[PDB]
């Protein structure tokens, strides 16, 4: 993936 919402 590109973009990991889980770290934000």
């Amino acid at each position, epitope marked *: 993936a590109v*973009g990991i919402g889980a770290v934000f």
Partner: antibody, heavy 121, light 110 residues
């Protein structure tokens, strides 16, 4: 970039240990999310768990939580997977993967080639 | 939390649409929507095609496109050829656990 290493064959109920060697950059980078993913032969993809920067930000698939542990070794630039009490359902190709946490970093991920692990006596 | 996506028989040169439905909205409070599409050709590791609903990854040809909203998403191949045969997976990275759809196999109809 990424290369998985495994034992080949694990006996049922024993523990599977895998390592992923990271190159081209440090595994401690805050630019990436590092995951273990697996695929039993002829089946779909399953996320095992992942890590952001260090051992204080590890998460697991609920279906594997309590049976898997993931760790990091910054000295070797590696991260690893330990899966206990393995059954034939754990026979699979195991992949490590690097995801940029933002497209601002770059617009591609990287998948290891994967390593087959077979659970059998 | 689960994503819902099976075989698609496609005449060559014709368009294909692959659907993905999520049990939860994939819209993050930061405004981004964390849904991605992969293609796995037989004997290969998966390759990222579309990240964050609609963006092609580096080097991905323009015959692939993505669209969607909240819980409903669609991957489109404009003109299907032999190199597009394989299994297409959607994935969400909104929250842990990260999750994959079950896959949609594309086969050429003849």
């Amino acid at each position: 970039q990424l290369q998985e290493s495994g034992p080949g064959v694990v006996k049922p109920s024993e523990t599977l240990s895998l390592t992923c060697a990271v190159s081209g950059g440090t595994i401690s980078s805050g630019s990436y999310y590092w995951s273990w993913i697996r695929q039993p032969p002829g089946k779909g993809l399953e996320w095992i768990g992942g890590i952001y920067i260090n051992n204080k930000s590890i998460n697991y698939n609920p279906s594997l939580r309590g049976r898997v542990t993931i760790s990091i070794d910054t000295s070797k630039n590696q991260f690893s997977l330990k899966l206990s009490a393995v059954t034939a359902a754990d026979t699979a190709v195991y992949y490590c993967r690097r995801d940029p946490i933002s497209s601002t970093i770059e617009e591609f991920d990287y998948w290891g080639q994967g390593v087959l692990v077979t659970v059998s006596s | 939390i689960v994503m819902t996506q099976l075989s698609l028989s496609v005449t060559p040169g014709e368009p294909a649409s692959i659907s993905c439905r999520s049990s939860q909205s994939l819209l993050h409070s930061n405004g981004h929507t964390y849904l991605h599409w992969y293609l796995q050709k037989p004997g290969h590791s998966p390759q990222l095609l579309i990240y964050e609903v609609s963006n092609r990854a580096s080097g991905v040809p323009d015959r692939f496109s993505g669209s969607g909203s909240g819980t409903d998403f669609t991957l489109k191949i404009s003109r299907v050829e032999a190199e597009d045969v394989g299994v297409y997976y959607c994935e969400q990275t909104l929250q842990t656990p990260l999750t994959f759809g079950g896959g949609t196999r594309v086969q050429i109809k003849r």
